[PDB]
Amino acid sequence: GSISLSQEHIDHLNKTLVELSPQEVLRWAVVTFPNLYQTTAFGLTGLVILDMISKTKPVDLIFIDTLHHFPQTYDLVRKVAAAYQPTLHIYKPKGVESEEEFAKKHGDSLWESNDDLYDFLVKVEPAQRAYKELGVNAVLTGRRKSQALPVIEVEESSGIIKINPLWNWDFAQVKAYITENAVPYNELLDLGYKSIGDWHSTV
To answer: Half-sphere exposure of 104 toward its Cβ, with a 13 Å CA cutoff?
Structure first.
């Protein structure tokens, strides 16, 4: 089963949840929703939320390993497994365990020869396999202010309820938190990267 919120109910929450700290939004989400998970690619906002979660009530992580992450990204996952020890569900392209295996099964540089198909294989399909296997009802996302955002959104296809605790944070306050709380971060940011995706499609 999946949880359905009335539109008048979604509207009430977006008016009251904005008065809460993100820490209070997280406690509220855990109390309110069954089958709640944090979906992250371990960008900066996901690390802020993960660190906040570590202080209170743990929430399982969902991580999509496209097999084409930066080496620096895999380093951060290893660091997070050590310092935070979360429950971490990792989903990969079905039946593939490495970028080399991916290239032999689907061809070289699929992300440019067939972008629609590369995206289904390494992003869309593992994510929908995760949501169905784990019976996900709500997810905490690291979506924030763009360089206003609702605190609650409903993904029309799956009925997944998205909660954005950092809805009112810009990039400055996020790096601020990372630095005071000594949160590990992707070392590619030291080279001036903003967003971090696959090693071949990050610009």
So the answer is: 6
Angle, CA 99 vertex, CA 47 and CA 95 arms, to 5°: 95
Whether 203 is in a domain gets the answer no
What resolution in angstroms, rounded to 1 decimal?
2.4
Q: Which domain holds residue 144?
A: 7-191
Way the structure was solved: X-ray
Residue recorded with tokens 């979360």: 86
* Strand partners of residue 163: 140, 152
Do 17 and 162 meet the contact criterion of CB atoms below 8 Å apart?
A: no
The pair of structure tokens assigned to 197 is: 């995706």
> How is residue 5 written in tokens?
């919120």
134 alpha-carbon distance from chain centroid: 15
Contact 20, 51 (CB under 8 A): no
Tokens representing 23 are 């820490």
Would you call 130 helix, strand, or coil by DSSP?
Answer: helix
Q: How many CA atoms lie within 13 A of 22 on its CB side?
A: 25
Q: How far apart are CA 98 and CA 81, in angstroms?
A: 20
Number of domains composing the chain: 1
Contact in structure between 33 and 161 (CB atoms under 8 Å): yes
* Residue 198 located in a structural domain: no
What whole-number distance in Å separates Cα of residue 102 and Cα of residue 60?
A: 27
